[PDB]
Amino acid sequence: ESINFVSWGGSTQDAQKQAWADPFSKASGITVVQDGPTDYGKLKAMVESGNVQWDVVDVEADFALRAAAEGLLEPLDFSVIQRDKIDPRFVSDHGVGSFFFSFVLGYNEGGGGASKPQDWTALFDTKTYPGKRALYKWPSPGVLELALLADGVPADKLYPLDLDRAFKKLDTIKKDIVWWGGGAQSQQLLASGEVSMGQFWNGRIHALQEDGAPVGVSWKQNLVMADILVVPKGTKNKAAAMKFLASASSAKGQDDFSNLTAYAPVNIDSVQRLDLANVYITADKQKNGIMANFKIRHNVEDGSVQLADHYQQNTPIGDGPVLLPDNHYLSTQSVLSKDPNEKRDHMVLLEFVTAAGITLGMDELYKGGMSKGEELFTGVVPILVELDGDVNGHKFSVRGEGEGDATNGKLTLKFICTTGKLPVPWPTLVTTLVQCFSRYPDHMKQHDFFKSAMPEGYVQERTISFKDDGTYKTRAEVKFEGDTLVNRIELKGIDFKEDGNILGHKLEYNFNANLAPNLPTAYVKDQITLDFAYWAKNGPAIATRWNEWLVKL
Numbered sequence: 001e002s003i004n005f006v007s008w009g010g011s012t013q014d015a016q017k018q019a020w021a022d023p024f025s026k027a028s029g030i031t032v033v034q035d036g037p038t039d040y041g042k043l044k045a046m047v048e049s050g051n052v053q054w055d056v057v058d059v060e061a062d063f064a065l066r067a068a069a070e071g072l073l074e075p076l077d078f079s080v081i082q083r084d085k086i087d088p089r090f091v092s093d094h095g096v097g098s099f100f101f102s103f104v105l106g107y108n109e110g111g112g113g114a115s116k117p118q119d120w121t122a123l124f125d126t127k128t129y130p131g132k133r134a135l136y137k138w139p140s141p142g143v144l145e146l147a148l149l150a151d152g153v154p155a156d157k158l159y160p161l162d163l164d165r166a167f168k169k170l171d172t173i174k175k176d177i178v179w180w181g182g183g184a185q186s187q188q189l190l191a192s193g194e195v196s197m198g199q200f201w202n203g204r205i206h207a208l209q210e211d212g213a214p215v216g217v218s219w220k221q222n223l224v225m226a227d228i229l230v231v232p233k234g235t236k237n238k239a240a241a242m243k244f245l246a247s248a249s250s251a252k253g254q255d256d257f258s259n260l261t262a263y264a265p266v267n268i269d270s271v272q273r274l275d276l277a278n279v280y281i282t283a284d285k286q287k288n289g290i291m292a293n294f295k296i297r298h299n300v301e302d303g304s305v306q307l308a309d310h311y312q313q314n315t316p317i318g319d320g321p322v323l324l325p326d327n328h329y330l331s332t333q334s335v336l337s338k339d340p341n342e343k344r345d346h347m348v349l350l351e352f353v354t355a356a357g358i359t360l361g362m363d364e365l366y367k368g369g370m371s372k373g374e375e376l377f378t379g380v381v382p383i384l385v386e387l388d389g390d391v392n393g394h395k396f397s398v399r400g401e402g403e404g405d406a407t408n409g410k411l412t413l414k415f416i417c418t419t420g421k422l423p424v425p426w427p428t429l430v431t432t433l434v435q436c437f438s439r440y441p442d443h444m445k446q447h448d449f450f451k452s453a454m455p456e457g458y459v460q461e462r463t464i465s466f467k468d469d470g471t472y473k474t475r476a477e478v479k480f481e482g483d484t485l486v487n488r489i490e491l492k493g494i495d496f497k498e499d500g501n502i503l504g505h506k507l508e509y510n511f512n513a514n515l516a517p518n519l520p521t522a523y524v525k526d527q528i529t530l531d532f533a534y535w536a537k538n539g540p541a542i543a544t545r546w547n548e549w550l551v552k553l
Contacts, residue, residue, distance in 0.1 A: 002031040003237050003244060007058040009037050010184060011207070012261065016058070016098075019256035020248040027247070030240050040067075047072045047233050055241040056248075057230050058098045060140060061090075064228035065536035068094035074231040080242040086249060089529060090226050090266040096249040097266025098227035099257055102520045102527070103142045105218040106134075106205040109303055111196035119220050120150040123197060124173055134189050134198025137179035139539070139546035141530040142223055143170075146199060149221055155528045163542065167549055190215060201225075206262035206518050209297075212304045212467060217516075219523040223530055226266070252327065255280070259293070264520040271327050271357035274522035277514045278356075279312075279330040279435070281449075288322060289315035289458065290449050297513035298427050301506045305513050307467040310431060314449065317479060318456030323371055325447035328357040330438055334430055334511040344416050347426040349402075349433075351411040355440040355447065365443060373454030374445065377406035377437065382484045383413060385433055391493030392470070392503060394423035400433055404485065406451070409439030424493070425507040432462070432474050434487055455480035470496030 005021060007013035013036060021032035038057055046052050059067070067073055073094040083091055090097030107117045111131050117123070123133055123146075135143050144161050147169040153162070170177075178195050180186040183204045189195045191213050202222070208215050229248055231241045247253050254265035258273065259280065265272055273280060276295040284291050292312040297305045316322050335350040385400035402413030415426075415433060436450035450458070457479025464472040476489035496503050517523070535542070 001029075001237075001240070002033060003055040003240050004033045004035045004053055005056050005058075005244070006036045006038050006054050007034075008182075010182070012183070012203075013037075013058075015257060015260035016248070019260055020244070020253050023253075023256075024244055024247045028243060030243070032244070043067070043232055044072060050234060052232050052234050052236065054232050055235045055237045056244050057232060058227050059095075059230055061095075061226040061228050061532040062140065062535035062539055064095040064230055065092065065532055066539065067230065068092065069536065072233050074233055074235065074238055074241075076231065076245065077239075077242045080239075081246045081249065085251070085268050087266050087268060089224075090228070092228075095228035095230050096245050098229045098248065099254070099261070099263040100224055100226040100266055100520065101263040102202045102219070102523070103136075103146070103199050103223040103225060104202045104205055105197065105220070106190060106200040106208075107197040107216055107218075108190055108193055108195075109214040109216050111193060116216065116218075117197055118218050120146045120199075123199075124150055124169065126173065126176060129197060131196025132176050132178045132194060133173055134178055134180055134186060134195040134200065136199060137181040139543040141225055141532070141535055142199060144542070144546075145223060145528070145530055146221070149528075155221070158528075159531050159534050160538075161534075161542070163545055167545075170549075202520055203261045203263050209305050209518070210295075210307045210467065212300075212306065214302075214304050219520075219526050221528055222520070222523050222526055223528050224520070225530060226532070255327065258519070258521075262519055271329055272521050273329050273357065274331070274519055275514065275517040276519065277332070279310075279332070280327070281325060281329060282327045283324040283449075284313065284315075285324065287313070287315050288324070289313065290325060296431060297518075298425070298501075299508040299510065299513040300501055301508060306469075306501045306507060308428065308431075309465040309467070310462060311464075312460065312462045314458045314460050316453040316456070316458050317477065318453060320372075320456065321452075323446060323449050323452035325449055326358065328355055328444065328447055330354065330435065331356050334514075336427065336430070336510055338509075339414065342414075342416075345420070345422045346417070347415045347430075349411070349413050349415065349430065353409040353411070353435070353438045355438055355444050358444050358447070360443045369442065370445060371448065371452040374448065374451045376454055376480065377404075377451055379407075380405050381437075383411070383434060383437075383487070384481075384484050385413065385415065385487040385489070387429075387433065387487075387489040387491060389489075389491035389493070391424055391472075391491070392496045392498070394493075394503075395419070396423055398422070398429070398433065404434060404437035406437045406439055409437065411437050424502050425505055426509065427507055427511060428466075428472075428502060430511065431464070432472065432476075432489060432491060434478060434485060436478065436485070466496075466502060469500045469502055470494055 251269040254267040254270040387398040396419040400415035440448040
C-alpha cells in the first residue's frame with residue numbers, strides 16, 4: 001500500500017525524495033511515488049471529479065489558503081501532526097509547512113567591484129550598478145513588496161499594496177528587467193552574466209556559491225516565503241498521507257531538507273543550524289557512535305568560494321558506556337594567524353566551540369540541576385596532534401602542540417609542517433587537525449558523546465570532498481596518553497588538480513568565507529514575512545493588474 005507525492009521537480013523535489021520519502025518508506029512500509037509537477041488546474045479537476053491520484057501536494061502558501069477556502073483539501077489530522085511544534089506562520093487547518101525560504105538580493109561580482117549592493121533600492125540604480133535585473137515572473141508574493149520597500153514604504157505599513165506605486169517604481173527599470181519563472185533559469189541568468197543582480201530564492205544563490213560562481217548576496221530586507229504540504233480532498237490514502245506530513249514536517253525531516261537545499265525548517269524542535277558549516281550531529285545506534293556532516297567554505301584568491309563537503313563518523317575505542325546524543329549541532333569560530341619569529345611552515349590556531357540546537361523549553365528544568373569521561377575536561381588539558389599525509393603522493397607530516405579548555409570551548413594550538421613546505425593550504429586541514437573540547441552547555445551534557453568515550457577514546461573517520469577537485473579520506477584516533485589528549489591521524493588525498501585551488505595554493509589564509517551565514521534562520525532580524533492571507537484574498541485581482549501590466553508597451 002502506497003502514496004503519490006507531488007512537487008516542483010528538479011533539485012527541490014530530488015531533495016524531498018531524499019530527505020523525507022526514503023526514510024518514510026524505510027520507517028513505515030508505505031512506499032512513495034514521485035509524481036509532478038504540481039499543477040493547480042489538475043488538482044482542482046481531480047478533486048471535483050472525485051478520482052484523486054495525488055495524496056500529498058507541495059503548493060505555494062497563498063495557493064494553500066485559497067484552495068482551502070474553496071474546500072479542495074482534507075482538514076489535517078492534528079493528533080498525527082504535532083501542531084504545537086510547527087511555526088504558526090506555516091500551519092493552518094488544511095496545510096503544514098514544506099519549508100520556508102527567503103527572497104534575497106543576489107548579485108554578480110564580475111559584473112561589479114568596489115561598492116557592494118545592499119538593499120532592494122540598489123536595483124533601481126542602474127547608474128551606480130549597471131546591467132539587467134532578474135525578478136520573478138509569475139504574479140505572487142515578493143516583487144511588488146520589494147518595489148514598495150525600495151520606494152520607501154516601511155515594512156510594517158506594506159499592506160494593502162499601493163499597486164499604483166509599485167508599477168510606478170517598476171516602470172523605472174522595466175526596459176532592463178529579465179524574468180525568471182523557475183530556479184534553474186534564475187541560476188543560469190546570473191552565472192551567465194545576462195543579468196548582474198536580482199531577486200532570487202536563497203537556495204539558488206546558495207547553489208551558485210557552492211558551484212564556485214563569483215556571486216554575493218545581501219539578506220537585508222529578505223522576504224520570507226513558504227510552501228505548504230496539502231492533502232487533496234478525497235485522497236484514498238488519508239491516514240497514510242497525514243503520516244507523511246507528520247514526517248516531512250518533523251524536526252528531523254526539516255533539518256535533513258534544510259541541509260540539502262539551504263532552505264529553512266518550519267519545525268520549532270528542529271536543530272536550526274544558522275550555517276551549513278555547523279557540524280550537524282546525529283546518533284548511530286547500530287555502531288554505538290555518531291555520524292556528522294557539514295560544509296566548510298574556503299575563500300579563493302580570485303574572490304570565489306571553494307567548498308569542502310564533510311562526512312564524518314565517530315565510533316568508540318572503549319567497551320565502556322557512551323552517550324548517544326539527540327540531534328544537535330556544533331558552532332565553531334576559527335582564527336588563523338602566524339608567529340612572526342617562526343621560520344617553518346606553520347599555523348597558529350585559536351578556536352571557540354559550543355554545542356547548540358536544542359534550547360530548553362519553558363517549564364523544563366527548575367529545581368535539581370553526566371559521564372565519567374566528562375570529568376577529565378574540567379580544567380586545561382595539553383593537546384598533541386600528529387598527522388601523516390599523502391595528497392597526490394606528496395608525503396607530509398604535521399605536528400601540533402597546545403592545550404584545550406572545554407569549560408570555555410577554547411583551543412589554542414600551533415602546528416608545524418615537519419616535512420618542509422606544506423603541500424596543501426593550511427585552511428584545508430583545520431577540520432582534520434578534537435570535538436571533545438566543545439563546550440556542551442548544561443542542559444545538553446547528556447548529548448556529549450566525545451567526552452563520554454574517554455579516556456580510551458574514539459576513532460574519527462571522514463571523507464572531505466572539495467568541489468571540482470580531489471577528496472581527503474582521513475582516519476584518526478583521539479584518546480588520552482598520560483595527561484595529554486592525542487589526535488593521531490592518517491590522511492590520503494586522491495584526484496587533486498596539480499594547479500587547482502588546493503595543490504595550486506590559491507586559498508586565502510583565514511576562515512572568513514564562513515563568517516557570513518548561508519541560511520535564512522540566521523537572518524531573522526532582517527526578515528520581512530509576506531502576508532499570504534492577503535494574497536489568497538486579492539491574488540486574482542492583483543494577477544489581472546500584473547498580467548495587464550507585463551503586456552503594456
